[PDB]
């Protein structure tokens, strides 16, 4: 033997304090993956199902990229996993792929880890011949860093730190400072729900419509229960089957924000874990 096994963690890299980037060996998932899609994983037998985005794929070598923020137990445990370790369950690719054509001038906005989700979209847009302007925000500067090697290699990048390069603070301010120049009819927002809400609230805009990648609570990820329930326009959609990407104008943000806080008692399993 002496080689790569199913769902092996091939490369692990710590790119920030509580942010970890994974390259995982899964030939099928890597081959069948379309931009905008995600996977649902389970670490151990007692483990839980959590959704995480595919950040990139190399089908020829059967690998897929994923970048994770540590906000609690499962993301923590995954970060503590070492090279050679396997993830117990990996199901994907789930969700509906991004709608990729040759539109025109496109604006992309992303936050910390959501940038990873925002990456294969960028590549795919640039794969379709779009001229992109990308906005990068993060938790901090190089203490918690955002991937420059992705965007600058893939497009012209405007860095919107919370007090460093480019403008200083929220990324909606960088979208705001288009003004004189600007572009024709597309904006993308991937990050925490608040940021995606605001990039939608760019509504002033130049009359440019927003695509957004939602992040609700998921269980199966196959559209079998409705945990990921979202109200688009006035009607109910499932972000695992109908999404995860929707049009921000039609997205109900307040209700999604309310639902992402639906389980806040979950801190308990973080504490019993953090003792060890």
């Amino acid at each position: 033997m002496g080689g790569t096994a199913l769902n092996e963690i091939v490369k692990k890299v710590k790119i920030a304090e509580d942010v970890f980037d994974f390259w995982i060996h899964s030939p099928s998932v890597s081959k069948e993956a379309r931009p905008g899609q995600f996977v649902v994983i389970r670490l151990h037998e007692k483990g839980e199902r959590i959704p995480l985005t595919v950040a990139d794929t190399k089908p020829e070598e059967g690998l897929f990229r994923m970048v994770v923020k540590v906000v609690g137990k499962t993301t923590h445990e995954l970060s503590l996993k070492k090279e050679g370790d396997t993830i117990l369950d990996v199901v994907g690719p789930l969700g509906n792929p991004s709608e990729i054509e040759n539109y025109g001038n496109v604006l992309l906005v992303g936050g910390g880890v959501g940038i990873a989700t925002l990456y294969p979209i960028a590549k795919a847009l640039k794969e379709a011949g779009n001229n992109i302007t990308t906005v990068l925000g993060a938790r901090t500067k190089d203490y918690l860093i955002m991937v420059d090697e992705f965007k600058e290699i893939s497009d012209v990048l405007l860095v919107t730190d919370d007090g460093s390069a480019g403008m200083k603070g929220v990324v909606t301010d960088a979208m705001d400072k288009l003004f004189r120049e600007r572009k024709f009819d597309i904006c993308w927002a991937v990050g925490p729900t608040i940021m995606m809400k605001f990039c939608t609230l760019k509504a002033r805009e130049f009359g440019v419509p927003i695509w957004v990648s939602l992040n609700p609570i998921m269980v199966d990820g196959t559209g079998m229960c409705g945990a990921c329930r979202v109200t688009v326009s006035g009607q109910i959609k499932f972000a695992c089957v109908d999404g995860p990407e929707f049009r921000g104008e039609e997205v109900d943000w307040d209700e999604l924000l309310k639902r992402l806080a639906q389980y806040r008692e979950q801190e308990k399993i973080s504490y019993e874990r953090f003792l060890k």
Binding site: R42, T74, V219, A227
Partner: protein, 468 residues
């Protein structure tokens, strides 16, 4: 009056209400023998007519009383792949024991046929083992089975024995279907399901877990790389009523609640990493087995009050009668002829209440035999901090569309021959809830049996429904 069923060991209501161990403990051998002597061995045996697959009921009961338990298991196994399940979960009240003549005597109960099937299956399951195999390397043809529920497991098992290459593809991490994520441990112990899976696994069947067909592997790949395909995906969407307050925190589909509780084991939290919301007063909408198991799952989580809320009367409740009583024994309260109008939430987000009305009978058959119409001024409110909606389920609409030429029924289920299981697509078969809609395990089993047999017949060239 006189002839009633033989009592079996059962968990006390007060002790079992907080844990998930099985309620019905099962017959001892002497108890099974006592019950078996009650069978009158009717030459016409109407009991058989009450069974969906017409198991030779007086036969296995007779071999049981004769102390020949080995023959009894094989008699059952000729008709039914999953007897340790059906003995537990079959609605015998409306099927086989509903046709038993000793029940037709004046104020007498039928022979506990389900319990005897359960006994023979369990007696030979808990301890006794069978044999090794695989024989599934005999034939040339490869078959793809989609779904590891009762249907897919049965179909795969039968096809493997016939010598064909069998690949089961399962979306979840544990096989399979309702037997793992649907029906709770206190009704169907998972040891039985895991056992059968290993048994089918020992027959040489390959399980592709964590594989969503149409996503992990495309439909047109399954059709390209396989000789036959069985669609046993079952049906669970689920269906939301859509009333106001549906998006509130604390409102659940029975799918999510039970998937968390059964498959993800949120009641063993924080041993298992899957959490569930608190529910001191919980309302479950519907009176089916899905609603009944959900409510019963909820009470074991430390619920102070659990309510059943149902549009129709008691007699119209589809749930298994024994389990209806079990729910009552655990303290669950039933509200008949009550229909929810909206859910009331607080500022922080949480379900505090529920607006409801009462119902009655007026029209004949607008939709559903006794179609219920609400009553004005019957409108009231119920205070609940948790809500689980179990009003039904549906087929997978996107997945079926990826099958070219596949014809659906009245409202989304696959058009498929009842006996052969053959659809409008060459070489493709289907069975279970994906065809009939909501139904029984034994029927899903049977469909798997029949489809497997005609896949064999088709792959040998003898029979071909697809000509033009």
């Amino acid at each position: 009056m006189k002839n009633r069923k033989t009592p079996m060991k059962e968990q006390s209501p007060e002790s079992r209400r907080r844990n998930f161990e099985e309620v019905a403990l099962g017959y001892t051998l002497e108890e099974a023998l006592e019950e078996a002597q009650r069978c009158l061995q009717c030459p016409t045996h109407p009991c058989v007519s009450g069974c969906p697959v017409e198991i030779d009921i007086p036969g296995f009961i007779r071999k049981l009383r004769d102390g020949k338990l080995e023959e009894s298991y094989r008699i059952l196994k000729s008709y039914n792949n999953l007897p340790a399940v059906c003995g537990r979960v079959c609605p015998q009240e409306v099927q086989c024991e509903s046709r038993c003549v000793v029940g037709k005597m004046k104020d007498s109960e039928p022979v506990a046929i389900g319990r005897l099937e359960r006994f023979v299956a369990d007696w030979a399951a808990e301890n006794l083992e069978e044999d090794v195999k695989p024989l599934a390397g005999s034939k040339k043809e490869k078959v793809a089975v989609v779904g590891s529920g009762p249907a897919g497991l049965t179909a795969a098992a039968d096809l493997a024995k016939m010598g064909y290459h069998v690949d089961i593809f399962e979306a979840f991490h544990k096989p399979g279907g309702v037997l793992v994520y649907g029906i709770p441990e206190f009704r169907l112990p998972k040891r039985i399901v895991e056992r059968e899976v290993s048994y089918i696994r020992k027959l040489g069947v390959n399980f592709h877990l964590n594989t969503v067909v149409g996503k992990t592997v495309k439909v047109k790949e399954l059709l390209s790389e396989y000789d036959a395909v069985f669609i046993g995906t079952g049906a669970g969407t689920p269906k939301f009523m859509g009333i106001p307050g549906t998006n509130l925190n604390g409102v659940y589909s029975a799918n999510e609640f039970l998937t968390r509780v059964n498959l993800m084991k949120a009641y063993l939290f924080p041993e298992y990493d899957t959490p569930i919301r608190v529910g001191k007063k919980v309302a479950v909408i519907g009176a089916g087995n899905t609603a009944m198991d959900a409510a019963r799952s909820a009470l074991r989580l430390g619920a102070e009050k659990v309510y059943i809320v149902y549009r129709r009367t008691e007699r119209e409740m589809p749930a298994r009668r024994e389990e209806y009583h079990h729910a009552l024994e655990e303290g669950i309260e039933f509200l008949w002829l009550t229909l929810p109008i909206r859910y009331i939430g607080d500022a922080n987000g949480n379900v505090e209440a529920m607006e409801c009305v009462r119902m009655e009978l007026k029209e004949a058959d607008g939709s559903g035999r006794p179609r219920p119409v609400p009553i004005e001024g019957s409108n009231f409110v119920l205070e609940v901090d948790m809500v689980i909606e179990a009003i039904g389920q549906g087929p997978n609409r996107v997945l079926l569309s990826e099958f070219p030429g596949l014809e659906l029924n009245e409202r989304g289920y696959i058009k498929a021959d009842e006996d052969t299981g053959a659809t409008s697509v060459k070489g493709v078969f289907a069975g279970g809830d994906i065809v009939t809609g909501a139904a029984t395990v034994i029927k899903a089993m049977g469909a798997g049996k029949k489809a497997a047999q005609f896949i064999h017949s088709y792959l040998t060239g003898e029979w071909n429904p697809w000509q033009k």
